[PDB]
Amino acid sequence: MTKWNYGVFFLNFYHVGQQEPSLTMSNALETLRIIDEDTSIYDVVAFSEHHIDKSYNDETKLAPFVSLGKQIHVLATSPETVVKAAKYGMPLLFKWDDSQQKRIELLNHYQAAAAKFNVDIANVRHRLMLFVNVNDNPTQAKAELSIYLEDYLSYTQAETSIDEIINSNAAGNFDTCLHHVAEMAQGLNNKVDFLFCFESMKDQENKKSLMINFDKRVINYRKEHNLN
Amino acid sequence: MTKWNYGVFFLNFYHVGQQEPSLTMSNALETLRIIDEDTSIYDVVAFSEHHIDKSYNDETKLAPFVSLGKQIHVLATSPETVVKAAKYGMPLLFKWDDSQQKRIELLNHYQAAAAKFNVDIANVRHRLMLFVNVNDNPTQAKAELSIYLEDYLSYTQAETSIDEIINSNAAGNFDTCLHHVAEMAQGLNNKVDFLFCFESMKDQENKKSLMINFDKRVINYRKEHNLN
Ligand SMILES: CCCCCCCCCCC[C@H](CC(=O)O)c1c(C)c(C)cc2c1nc1c(=O)[nH]c(=O)nc-1n2C[C@H](O)[C@H](O)[C@H](O)COP(=O)(O)O
Ligand SMILES: CCCCCCCCCCC[C@H](CC(=O)O)c1c(C)c(C)cc2c1nc1c(=O)[nH]c(=O)nc-1n2C[C@H](O)[C@H](O)[C@H](O)COP(=O)(O)O
Ligand SMILES: CCCCCCCCCCC[C@H](CC(=O)O)c1c(C)c(C)cc2c1nc1c(=O)[nH]c(=O)nc-1n2C[C@H](O)[C@H](O)[C@H](O)COP(=O)(O)O
Ligand SMILES: CCCCCCCCCCC[C@H](CC(=O)O)c1c(C)c(C)cc2c1nc1c(=O)[nH]c(=O)nc-1n2C[C@H](O)[C@H](O)[C@H](O)COP(=O)(O)O
């Protein structure tokens, strides 16, 4: 057992769930407010911005480094990129928009690389980005996540299937999400810390209540298991 | 008096001071190593990546948000962007590649905006990115910084003058840099925390020694002034 770390991410995209930009902005500021004043477990913030091509004039690409606090992660963008991270034993950052199956393929490819280069990654913990929508009515959590993501999936011309996206993220009641996320972590050898995106939750009070309930549960768990 | 915060940044660019990429990479990992094991003041890490255009298909641009730890900053890319940050009282991130004169214009434009919107920014602290090259021989610090930046300035087709860039950053002996940086902060109303880029220092031991000496000096200062 080890202490699992949590954080938050924001999707840097202007059109989500037919919301006007200033509404999306306002919702995001509330999330920030909750992290700063209402809770203590949300350690770092990151942005999802891989929908934009970041290339130089000669077609070489910006290196996909992401800092989380003082820790540098490499966005797991392709099997080749994960091998470059393995060369230095650097932690990965898994995309929320990759299916769980793809994430697992990528982590194992990384593990194969390290073994091949003889790099000790025993202590490396990666980060997994997940969209989280918790609703007492499971159907409503899913509908909300779906509506939120429609323009982005359309923009990115995703092959995916919103179904898969949903299955690879966390939409449902609290208990279902807890378990589903633990399952996904297991799928990734329990080597992943997390970044959650709560922006699909339309109700700000529900978002607040969820973030605070989870904060308290994690603090208790850490204490109970001598994880702090 | 207030506690000034420090961090580090890396320039996400492959060609610096005629170094092969793996050498630049290796130097950067040493910086990370020093921050994690040898010191405690370097709080956050960021990347300089504004040399790449980040636009959508319709010519709209990615919003220039940067997270530092759990704090969201807006890159001060233009007077209009700074007004958008002022609307919400968000902190700015000043570019190392803007002359000091331009930074001062931008901060005051931000302050004018906030006053106009009646937004209280009393408590806001911004972050300033600076390249730091400390050498007992002042001439050598400058030459090193100049050689390091030549390809980047050329790529960005900077209007600037490496001279100005140098004057707006910190190259020289330790005491000169301490004072020069304090001066720049004063120019920005003492409302700036910092991000330093040490990558132009060719000698890894000198880089290490500098980072550790500064760490100790800051800890003492904080204690002496009841800043912690
Ligand atoms: C607002 C967010 C809602 C979305 C939900 C996100 C869920 C986050 C992951 C779950 C955290 C649980 C702990 C907690 O309540 O804080 C949790 C759960 C629900 C489950 C089923 C298993 C967990 C777990 N948390 C763990 C943790 O922090 N550290 C661990 O080491 N293990 C955790 N586990 C057990 C895990 O599934 C594995 O069984 C063990 O890691 C295996 O260890 P071993 O026996 O030593 O090999
Ligand atoms: C602690 C981190 C600080 C970073 C400081 C900036 C240093 C830049 C030099 C990086 C050199 C690496 C090469 C090596 O083996 O050492 C490197 C790395 C680690 C990564 C992740 C990507 C790199 C890369 N070097 C490149 C280079 O010299 N020239 C390139 O043209 N591209 C390089 N890349 C990018 C990589 O080749 C891929 O194009 C991107 O990862 C995008 O991949 P995709 O989308 O998955 O296809
Ligand atoms: C490896 C890096 C080398 C590059 C050098 C970076 C320099 C960083 C800025 C300087 C930090 C000094 C403190 C320290 O040693 O840790 C410092 C210096 C050198 C000077 C000349 C003035 C400083 C100062 N640090 C300050 C700080 O942390 N907090 C403050 O509030 N004030 C500092 N000052 C004084 C400042 O110039 C102003 O006089 C006061 O802020 C004015 O306050 P007021 O009277 O209450 O209005
Ligand atoms: C706590 C932060 C979490 C972020 C979550 C993502 C939210 C995205 C919505 C942002 C809406 C803003 C508009 C408003 O007044 O509320 C906003 C902001 C704050 C900023 C900094 C830039 C924005 C922007 N909204 C835009 C929009 O709706 N449509 C656009 O096409 N562009 C927007 N921009 C970008 C801005 O207009 C500039 O193009 C960029 O700042 C680049 O500027 P330049 O390089 O300085 O020219």
Curated annotation (Swiss-Prot), chains A, B:
Member of which family?
A: Belongs to the bacterial luciferase oxidoreductase family.
For activity, the cofactor(s) needed are: FMN
An example of a GO molecular function for this protein is: alkanal monooxygenase (FMN-linked) activity
Q: What is this protein called?
A: Non-fluorescent flavoprotein
Query: Pfam families from the entry?
Result: Bac_luciferase
User: Which InterPro entries does the record cross-reference, listed alphabetically?
Assistant: Bacterial_luciferase_CS (IPR018235), Luciferase-like_dom (IPR011251), Luciferase-like_sf (IPR036661), Luciferase_bac/NFP (IPR002103)
Extract the CDD domains matched here. Answer: Flavin_utilizing_monoxygenases (cd00347)
Record's subunit section: Homodimer.
What broad taxonomic lineage does this protein's source fall under?
A: Bacteria, Pseudomonadati, Pseudomonadota, Gammaproteobacteria, Vibrionales
Q: Which UniProt keywords apply?
A: Flavoprotein
Cofactor descriptive note:
Binds 2 FMN per subunit. Each FMN has a myristate attached. This flavin-fatty acid linkage is probably the result of an enzyme-catalyzed reaction, most likely the bioluminescence reaction itself.
